[PDB]
């Protein structure tokens, strides 16, 4: 029944040939896992120090405290704040890791990038006050580096990837309740200290904490994003596809797996001077491919196809058609180190600090990115040419996907209809009830739930509500394997209203049709493309983003950097849905904080709902309180 | 049968008296827990992603693998890491606390605070190589603040606090291995990011990495030190008390309690200020005495006595004396806010991110300590008037204690022997087999262990074989409480050899007697002290200090913070001792990298085992070892 393990019919035809060749999946190995242990699905369980590990029952008797004292409020909270640090860190890496490659740009140390979006350069340096004028490009982008390092520190100013790009009145909200980072990399630290034996011990103190370190979250994401689009391009729209089916028999398929564009932007370039090479080796080219995020990186900046995405990554594997899978770091699955050697792909790690036991490592310094990606790409050809003659099943499903809307990229297609106010056609429209408000989807998909179906079931419901849904990582994933990204489905899936707008949008673009049904915003960083869209429109209209309506849903969330994301996206001011549990049910002092009473400190909340068709009817409950709070209709 | 719990004498007494009140303790809520769970012990469970919470059986069927695929090996890995960094955290918060206060009094904003040690700012300024001559103290004090901050982060050269104490030999080992920190922050956050789900999975690679953050926990202990010495003094040799029976009834009693002498010192020193106040009260006097680490910082410097230490922490507040318990953070456990009310003790937190539920929280910012000690001393006197007439149950059990052995006061000690070369001495009867090594005693007692036990055996064989036995924190605390630090003990404790040297060193100080059995070397972060002593040994002798007889023992280990030490005792090249089960059991292969394959990267190596007298025999033998290998008799 493999209909209850994913919804995405390429992935179902993959798990039937896993099965009968015996090669062990995610889902595999969750159903070995069952029955999960309780008190780590609730977060009743403590391992903070030798003399644990502590637990409390949920119900019953005891244990009902930590051998230290700690309470079941304390116990939650401590593992939720860890978890909201561990989400940042792998944001600080991957924007840090940007960073470090545009300073040794700028100073001659690494040839093969360059500042490829000079626009983006000098309105990033206005934001942050970097003077532009009578300076070079080059000295500008240097000072753009180095205030992106220095946020991670402690200095005279606080955060400025969070002041710099949320209106004065939410940094006001937010410094009144000391919920401003002074450093990202500080604040990690400082929450691992909190949360550490006999410290922090109380929950609401705890949890202030944490939606901290979730604004440090958020300052590398936006970090993340706006390098990125200076090294490699502000996205625009583009054609692309996406599934299984992007693979080709005849090409070396090439996927770009984790989350770097530092990393993939070059893989993309490269592969294209080795054609030649690849066609030699009885190839057709060179097919690059992405899954998660990284994918999402390449898909927005140059239409590459997407494989697939999260849970169902090894499934590109088992079609017995991937050459290689190149890998820097998050959310890669280690099985695919010991599934290579069942299918025949080679999988190449490429960072220091990401390796796995059983896969070749080919260190990739942005020194040498071109020597190195050829390094890598060859490999890929060697195998190839080993699977001469083998028949490979790559199932002959693909959708239609156009993506590429940036913020940028929005505001562009709206100024189609009014040059010199471009936010105002869609505020009109939220107005007169076209559009009913908007829903970003966001995060992962999570083996506890059949792939996809809290997407999809969501964002129908929504659609034909006349809500405007975005998207992002691998909810952009799941969405657009299902046809959510191709503008032919407006018509079955979005109400009248919103049908209008796309339609006058897109009409007024030249497209002779709509916008797709939902717009992708990009990879996970590029939640901060969502973050600047709501600001700007806060901005337009004066007001602060706990009155918009706008929601998001983290429908399917799996990693720490997800729990990051949702708590960022509550401590700016949006209900925020969550479709799987986190471990906070073991303490309702906790659950009733995060899901109620801090709406009285940044005006969002978390919504905790599992099933689907129920989420959907709380988010548009949701968007339509804030349409009366504003004295709209609904 | 309070022998169970404790071998202190006056914690079995309190413990009959908690039980006959009925009030909860540590021990009663061990027994609580118990059993254990068998993942959590072992290291076999994984909560890195909301897919989980994954466990592996240690032995039989399935489940063995992560749900991503996560092997043991991988899942121990990870979890130790996440404790290697949540240890370097405090000691980063304590030693950037430090640092700021240090940057506030220099520039005229926290005028309780200044430079008592001038020497050894001059000195550290010298380490560090920034340059003293001509400047004016504060402006090398200020120039030493900035080096400290900057170690939190990369910068053009790595963290000083690492490459400057030890020696070039050293340094090049761990170089060659990448395994010197580039900022103590940026490695905690690495940490937390690569063990992250999707990211690092190759066992090695991973305590590569731990390693590394060791080391960054290294340097925030080493800067702890060095700046507490700037701004409060370094220890020299002082007489004073140990255990319950320092407590007096007819005085207010406060205790100090956690970690940073920033608050504990000021205390000090404003309560000798208010003996008036507290005399109109009734009382004779105010009675600071002295918890854990910050305890141990007050007994350094002015010879504070100490009540108690770590696991044994509650039963100060059962005397029914305790008016008063002063916080900041780390080691605390969260059952004293609820103690409290049964017992009267009025407890105060004072950090914004260490707050207990229940407990009175009175800021304390530097820029006004003196003002929020009178604040906190006066709810102290106030609640000894509450008080009046309630009989207390104060163990008359108390040991004489010589401590403030820094490693100055060593070096001077040993300077009486030899003016010009003060180490020779020491090597000279490490040489003649008078002293056969050096053992360092560090960290806490933990509730498995009944308390002190492990400390105690170990010490007694070793003293008997003629080490010279050094120790800190509530190691320190376990010995000193036992009488390891009182003279008078000497010819029941020491090996002839060892009373020789010992007996030949007090003489040439003038004190008719000899030095204590153990010498007290301060504070967890003081552990910084022994490596001074260690690399100077090294150095003066031209050799590395893996071939040194020197090893380290956390024979009772709690914290992640002990993990932590331990940890960087192994990196710098110490045969180490753990007296418990860290969670690595599940993993041969990790087990086998952390007791024997790491020798042969760092030279050090963990040595785990919990029988006392097998210890001390595994401990004999690593000395011996290091003997032999420098061609001596053993
Ligand atoms: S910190 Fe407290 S609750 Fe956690 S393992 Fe240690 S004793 Fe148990
Ligand atoms: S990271 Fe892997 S092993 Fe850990 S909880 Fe998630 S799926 Fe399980
Ligand atoms: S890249 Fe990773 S963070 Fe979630 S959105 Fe996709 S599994
Ligand atoms: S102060 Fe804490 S780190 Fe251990 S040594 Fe004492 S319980
Ligand atoms: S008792 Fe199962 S997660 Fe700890
Ligand atoms: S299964 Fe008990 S510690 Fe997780
Ligand atoms: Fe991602
Ligand atoms: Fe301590
Ligand atoms: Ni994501
Ligand atoms: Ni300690």
Known sequence: ????????????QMLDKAKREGIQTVWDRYEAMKPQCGFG?????????????????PFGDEPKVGICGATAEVIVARGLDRSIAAGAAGHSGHAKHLAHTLKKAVQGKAASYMIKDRTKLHSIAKRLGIPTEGQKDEDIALEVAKAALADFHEKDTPVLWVTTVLPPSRVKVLSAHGLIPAGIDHEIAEIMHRTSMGCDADAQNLLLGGLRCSLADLAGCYMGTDLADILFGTPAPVVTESNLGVLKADAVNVAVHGHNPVLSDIIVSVSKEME???????????????ICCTGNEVLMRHGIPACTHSVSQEMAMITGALDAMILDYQCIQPSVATIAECTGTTVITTMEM?????????????????????QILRLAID???????????????????????????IINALSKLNANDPLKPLIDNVVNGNIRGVCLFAGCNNVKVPQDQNFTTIARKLLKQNVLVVATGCGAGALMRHGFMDPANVDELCGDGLKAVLTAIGEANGLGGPLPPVLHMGSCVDNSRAVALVAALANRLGVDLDRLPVVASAAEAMHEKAVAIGTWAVTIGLPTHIGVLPPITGSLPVTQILTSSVKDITGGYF????????????????????????????
């Open 276 to 290: 030649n090479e690849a066609r030699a080796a009885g190839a057709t080219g060179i097919n690059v491919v992405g």
């Open 607 to 634: 919504i905790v709902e599992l099933d689907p068709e129920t989420a959907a009817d709380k988010l548009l409950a949701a968007i339509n309180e804030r349409r009366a709070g504003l004295g709209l209709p609904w």
């Open 354 to 374: 990401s390796k796995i036991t059983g896969a070749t490592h080919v260190n990739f310094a942005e020194e040498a990115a071109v020597e190195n990606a050829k």
């Open 383 to 409: 195998t190839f040419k080993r699977r001469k003659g083998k028949p490979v099943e790559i199932p002959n499903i693909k959708t239609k996907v156009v993506a590429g809307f940036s913020t940028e990229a």
């Open 1 to 12: 029944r493999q209909n209850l393990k994913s919804t995405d019919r390429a992935v179902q």
């Open 41 to 57: 699905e609730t977060g009743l369980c403590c391992r903070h120090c030798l003399q644990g590990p502590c637990r409390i029952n």
